[PDB]
Design a protein around this nucleic acid. Structure first.
Ligand SMILES: [Mg+2]
Ligand SMILES: [Mg+2]
Ligand SMILES: [Mg+2]
Ligand SMILES: [Mg+2]
Ligand SMILES: [Mg+2]
Ligand SMILES: [Mg+2]
Ligand SMILES: [Mg+2]
Ligand SMILES: [Mg+2]
Ligand SMILES: [Mg+2]
Ligand SMILES: [Mg+2]
Ligand SMILES: [Mg+2]
Ligand SMILES: [Mg+2]
Ligand SMILES: [Mg+2]
Ligand SMILES: [Mg+2]
Ligand SMILES: [Mg+2]
Ligand SMILES: [Mg+2]
Ligand SMILES: [Mg+2]
Ligand SMILES: [Mg+2]
Ligand SMILES: [Mg+2]
Ligand SMILES: [Mg+2]
Ligand SMILES: [Mg+2]
Ligand SMILES: [Mg+2]
Ligand SMILES: [Mg+2]
Ligand SMILES: [Mg+2]
Ligand SMILES: [Mg+2]
Ligand SMILES: [Mg+2]
Ligand SMILES: [Mg+2]
Ligand SMILES: [Mg+2]
Ligand SMILES: [Mg+2]
Ligand SMILES: [Mg+2]
Ligand SMILES: [Mg+2]
Ligand SMILES: [Mg+2]
Ligand SMILES: [Mg+2]
Ligand SMILES: [Mg+2]
Ligand SMILES: [Mg+2]
Ligand SMILES: [Mg+2]
Ligand SMILES: [Mg+2]
Ligand SMILES: [Mg+2]
Ligand SMILES: [Mg+2]
Ligand SMILES: [Mg+2]
Ligand SMILES: [Mg+2]
Ligand SMILES: [Mg+2]
Ligand SMILES: [Mg+2]
Ligand SMILES: [Mg+2]
Ligand SMILES: [Mg+2]
Ligand SMILES: [Mg+2]
Ligand SMILES: [Mg+2]
Ligand SMILES: [Mg+2]
Ligand SMILES: [Mg+2]
Ligand SMILES: [Mg+2]
Ligand SMILES: [Mg+2]
Ligand SMILES: [Mg+2]
Ligand SMILES: [Mg+2]
Lengths: 116, 128, 117, 58
RNA sequence: GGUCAAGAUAGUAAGGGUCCACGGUGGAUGCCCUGGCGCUGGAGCCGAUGAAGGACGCGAUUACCUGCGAAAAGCCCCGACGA
RNA sequence: CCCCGGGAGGGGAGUGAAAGAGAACCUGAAACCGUGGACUUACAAGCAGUCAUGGCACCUUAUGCGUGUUAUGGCGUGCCUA
RNA sequence: CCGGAAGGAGUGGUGGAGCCGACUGAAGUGCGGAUGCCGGCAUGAGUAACGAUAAAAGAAGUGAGAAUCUUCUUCGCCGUAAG
RNA sequence: UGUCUCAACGAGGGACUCGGUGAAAUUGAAUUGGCUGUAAAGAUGCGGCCUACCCGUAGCAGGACGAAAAGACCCCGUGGAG
């Protein structure tokens, strides 16, 4: 049974679940938009949304919080001093997804997730 | 156009295949290819090319390619009206079979059957 | 000289397969099961050729005493009284058809009722 | 051998009997409003890349 | 014609069945001989002058077969044949 | 030579008596897989046939004549060995 | 369609080069069985499996076509080893 | 001390759904119900009576005297071997 849910196991253990959502947040932040499986995108959406909301605070604490997950110093810098400040007057919804059909090899359906 | 005996009817009536094209020896099993082909069937040839663009089977590919030679042959060799074609008939039949023996537990072997397919499809000026 | 089976087996086999016609499943397309079905079919054939005559006897009887009871008689009674009347010797087939021509069967009933009072 | 095993070979009829349920569903394809090609719904028109505006290359 | 009532019956095929038609698979059957089998008869030993059977090579180009053997798909003499 | 295809494969054109021989190259049976069509099947108990009758369909050893299919009734315990 | 049976003929379709009928003679001469033999094709079924639970992600490139090939940056795994 | 009263919650790998590749043992043919009775004496398949619209998917193992090895026990053979 499962009448309350944090998201997905994907098909991975606690350690990986994390390492993935971290890496994919890092790439969407470095890259503005990326396409991946529709699932992994839906799973990415709130992690990265909350991450930008953390960095939106400006003080050293929020930067060190972001450093906890985005372990590449330049992406954290960009999110801190570039992207979050831009999202200043935006109350969430930093992120959007749109779906782009189906893949050849596994016949899986990819989609794009991009900064708003 | 009556004739008198076989050999002359053979030497002056060469007997053609309008709208027809075959993809012999495609390396897929006829069962799956038949699923795709069954969705194509009595259908406008546009929708044929559409449905095939958006249907997720590995067999949509060759079935699409053959769907084109029909069109091509209807419009080049046979002088038909492309704005009027449809899939009057389409079917898959069995080719030869690549039998590959494969190993198994505790010494025995086993024969895997890579089936092949003859995908034929045949277009026509759907009047009424 | 060698004398392999050649043409012969296929021809007997096709003879059975053509006897098969609308036999369900393998019964009509695999030889052995067609042959075996035709064994039991032999049984049924000969015996039914007998039986059909019991069958039509039964049906004429049904109709004849149906008509006999239309007038207040019955097969036992009507058949006997007709038998008592200078032996009519109409077949049971024929008495039925006169149960398709009621005005006559009626008079046969009155006649059987006579030779019986 | 193989604990459970099947008893009689299944009929040509009953085998196609079960299969009355494997027919594929054709996509509900629709006409893209800008590229004048066909596209899956709630996805991005592959032909022109458009999705009200235009997101993907080519 | 209209409503209500009571009664009777039709068509639909997801799929299946028998028959037909047209193909696909497969390679039986018919025809055929490039290969065998037996009987009859013929002929019957090779080798230290190197046998039997092989290895490695020989070609413009050569993997396999044939032929040959550093004089290597071959060299010399005689007879035959005559493009 | 031309067409669709990366190809494979095919459709034309041409050779040929023939391509109803095209190099997966004489014939090309059967099992086995399919497409189309006739007649049919979703209250039904079944060695699958057999007899009987009605319905529908077709007419090249073939209009009383059937042939194919079918509904309902009756009947009906595969083959062989032992 | 024909004969009492094994069976035989007519006609139409294929096929592309050999073959009926009669009389006699000789047989490797007649298949459903043999857990028979060789070969082909079915059912189980689009099922079980895809071979260590050391994860993988995004960008870029090439190409007819990429989850799987190349490149970049990260991640995870062995390290008396999985050098 | 979850062996147990007596099992719960959670994890991962399968099982499930989609796309790719795709076996096996077995298979007289099958249009393959229940009770009771009868039958070579344990009946889907005979008799009577009941019940039951067509077709699947996930699952359980009572039947199909389920599958596998022409019983290793037992007897038999004027069988064999140590
Ligand atoms: Mg998985
Ligand atoms: Mg970029
Ligand atoms: Mg907050
Ligand atoms: Mg000519
Ligand atoms: Mg081994
Ligand atoms: Mg009698
Ligand atoms: Mg009513
Ligand atoms: Mg259908
Ligand atoms: Mg000879
Ligand atoms: Mg030597
Ligand atoms: Mg040399
Ligand atoms: Mg040599
Ligand atoms: Mg020398
Ligand atoms: Mg000379
Ligand atoms: Mg000469
Ligand atoms: Mg070309
Ligand atoms: Mg070509
Ligand atoms: Mg041809
Ligand atoms: Mg030919
Ligand atoms: Mg072949
Ligand atoms: Mg070819
Ligand atoms: Mg070829
Ligand atoms: Mg020839
Ligand atoms: Mg041939
Ligand atoms: Mg149809
Ligand atoms: Mg049909
Ligand atoms: Mg009914
Ligand atoms: Mg009946
Ligand atoms: Mg004949
Ligand atoms: Mg010739
Ligand atoms: Mg013999
Ligand atoms: Mg046999
Ligand atoms: Mg016998
Ligand atoms: Mg075999
Ligand atoms: Mg395993
Ligand atoms: Mg490119
Ligand atoms: Mg990659
Ligand atoms: Mg991998
Ligand atoms: Mg690699
Ligand atoms: Mg680079
Ligand atoms: Mg080492
Ligand atoms: Mg649990
Ligand atoms: Mg679990
Ligand atoms: Mg039933
Ligand atoms: Mg009793
Ligand atoms: Mg009982
Ligand atoms: Mg019965
Ligand atoms: Mg019973
Ligand atoms: Mg009911
Ligand atoms: Mg189980
Ligand atoms: Mg057993
Ligand atoms: Mg024994
Ligand atoms: Mg002894």
């Amino acid at each position: 049974m499962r009448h309350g849910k944090a998201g997905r196991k994907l098909n991975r253990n606690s350690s990986a679940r994390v390492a993935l959502a971290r890496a994919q947040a890092t790439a969407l932040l470095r890259e503005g938009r990326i396409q991946t499986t529709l699932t992994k995108a839906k799973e990415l959406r709130p992690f990265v949304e909350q991450l930008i909301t953390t960095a939106k605070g400006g003080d050293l604490h929020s930067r060190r919080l972001v450093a906890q997950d985005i372990h590449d110093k330049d992406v954290v810098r960009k999110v801190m001093d570039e992207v979050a400040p831009k999202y200043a007057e935006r109350p969430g919804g930093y992120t959007r997804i749109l779906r782009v059909g189906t893949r050849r090899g596994d016949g899986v359906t990819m989609a794009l997730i991009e900064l708003v | 156009a009556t004739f008198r005996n076989k050999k002359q009817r053979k030497q002056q009536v060469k007997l053609r295949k309008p709208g027809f094209a075959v993809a012999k020896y495609v390396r897929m099993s006829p069962r799956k290819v038949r699923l795709v082909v069954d969705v194509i069937r009595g259908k406008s040839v546009q929708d044929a090319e559409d449905l095939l663009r958006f249907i997720p089977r590995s067999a949509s590919e060759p079935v699409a390619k053959v769907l084109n030679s029909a069109k091509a042959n209807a419009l080049h060799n046979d002088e038909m009206l492309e704005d009027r074609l449809f899939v009057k008939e389409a079917y898959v039949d069995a080719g030869p079979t690549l039998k590959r023996l494969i190993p198994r537990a505790r010494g025995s072997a086993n024969i895997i059957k890579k089936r092949t397919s003859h995908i034929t499809i045949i277009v026509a000026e759907k009047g009424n | 000289p060698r004398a392999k089976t050649g043409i012969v087996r296929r021809r007997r086999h096709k003879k059975v397969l053509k006897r098969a016609k609308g036999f369900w499943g393998s019964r009509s397309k695999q030889y052995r099961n067609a042959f075996q079905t035709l064994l039991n079919a032999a049984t049924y054939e000969y015996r039914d050729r007998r039986n059909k005559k019991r069958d039509f006897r039964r049906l004429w009887i049904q109709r004849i005493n149906a008509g006999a009871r239309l007038h207040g008689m019955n097969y036992s009674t009507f058949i006997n009284g007709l038998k008592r009347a200078n032996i009519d010797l109409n077949r049971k087939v024929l008495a039925d058809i006169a149960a398709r021509e009621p005005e006559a069967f009626k008079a046969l009933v009155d006649a059987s009722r006579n030779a019986r009072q | 051998a193989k604990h459970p095993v099947p008893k009689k070979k299944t009929s040509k009829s009953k085998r196609d009997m079960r299969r009355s349920h494997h027919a594929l569903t054709a996509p509900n394809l629709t006409e893209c409003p800008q590229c004048h090609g066909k596209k899956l719904s709630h996805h991005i028109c592959p032909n022109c890349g458009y999705y009200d505006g235009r997101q993907v290359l080519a």
